[PDB]
Amino acid sequence: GGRWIDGKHVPAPRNEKAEIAIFGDIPVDASGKDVPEPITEFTSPPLDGLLLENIKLARFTKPTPVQKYSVPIVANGRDLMACAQTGSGKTGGFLFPVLSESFKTGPSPQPERKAYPTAVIMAPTRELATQIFDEAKKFTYRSWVKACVVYGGSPIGNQLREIERGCDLLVATPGRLNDLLERGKISLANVKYLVLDEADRMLDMGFEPQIRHIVEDCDMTPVGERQTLMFSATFPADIQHLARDFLSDYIFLSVG
Numbered sequence: 169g170g171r172w173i174d175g176k177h178v179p180a181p182r183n184e185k186a187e188i189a190i191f192g193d194i195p196v197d198a199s200g201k202d203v204p205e206p207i208t209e210f211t212s213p214p215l216d217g218l219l220l221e222n223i224k225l226a227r228f229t230k231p232t233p234v235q236k237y238s239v240p241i242v243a244n245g246r247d248l249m250a251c252a253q254t255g256s257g258k259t260g261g262f263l264f265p266v267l268s269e270s271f272k273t274g275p276s277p278q279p280e281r282k283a284y285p286t287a288v289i290m291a292p293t294r295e296l297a298t299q300i301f302d303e304a305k306k307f308t309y310r311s312w313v314k315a316c317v318v319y320g321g322s323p324i325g326n327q328l329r330e331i332e333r334g335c336d337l338l339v340a341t342p343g344r345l346n347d348l349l350e351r352g353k354i355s356l357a358n359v360k361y362l363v364l365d366e367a368d369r370m371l372d373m374g375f376e377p378q379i380r381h382i383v384e385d386c387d388m389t390p391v392g393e394r395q396t397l398m399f400s401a402t403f404p405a406d407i408q409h410l411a412r413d414f415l416s417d418y419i420f421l422s423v424g
Contacts, residue, residue, distance in 0.1 A: 172274045172312040180310040196233045200419035206236035216271035232257030247415040248397045252423035266361045276358040285338040287361040292369040294319040297339045320344040342375040356388035367400040392416040
């Protein structure tokens with residue numbers, strides 16, 4: 169794959185043979201301070217050039233209703249609270265801006281046993297974490313970002329070995345991420361992007377104590393310094409309070 173060498177992104181060359189196995193309206197309200205204009209097409213001056221190539225190899229034509237706002241919002245360095253339905257294209261809604269910004273800014277230096285992820289994505293279930301992981305693997309093609317996925321209800325021994333093989337984008341369920349942090353196998357000090365997907369579901373399952381412990385009680389880059397995206401189909405008070413603590417001057421995006 170690709171590398172990040174001497175503060176520059178060095179992508180790997182294309183492999184035509186693998187690309188076959190890799191690749192083959194809805195109303196929107198964006199409210200907040202200094203909301204940017206939505207993009208109508210995927211363009212490289214806004215988006216990282218390599219990701220744009222992968223987006224075209226995937227044959228994606230038009231940004232979904234969520235992506236047309238999440239791309240410029242994150243490119244401008246702002247936090248995002250997105251209230252969108254399932255079919256809105258949520259996964260790309262946060263994967264594209266995060267991968268785009270990760271491709272162009274790269275990771276922070278590491279004091280090189282621990283993993284130092286640049287991006288962390290929490291999800292309620294193993295299946296959803298696997299879906300996010302699969303899409304991330306697709307669009308990290310040729311890039312420096314190494315994706316990894318962990319989840320509960322599965323032996324932790326093998327997840328540690330996959331972690332030690334390098335981990336720049338980590339998809340996790342909160343319980344298993346908390347267990348790995350207690351074992352001293354992950355450092356959150358290099359986190360530049362934090363995503364909480366279907367956060368209402370995670371709270372419904374009782375994950376809030378672990379999620380807040382992960383974000384506040386450990387060594388994660390603090391709010392305002394990091395960029396944070398929160399996705400939740402609903403916006404109850406407990407989710408409003410999570411957004412207040414985890415986001416900074418966020419833009420509210422409502423789809424459907």
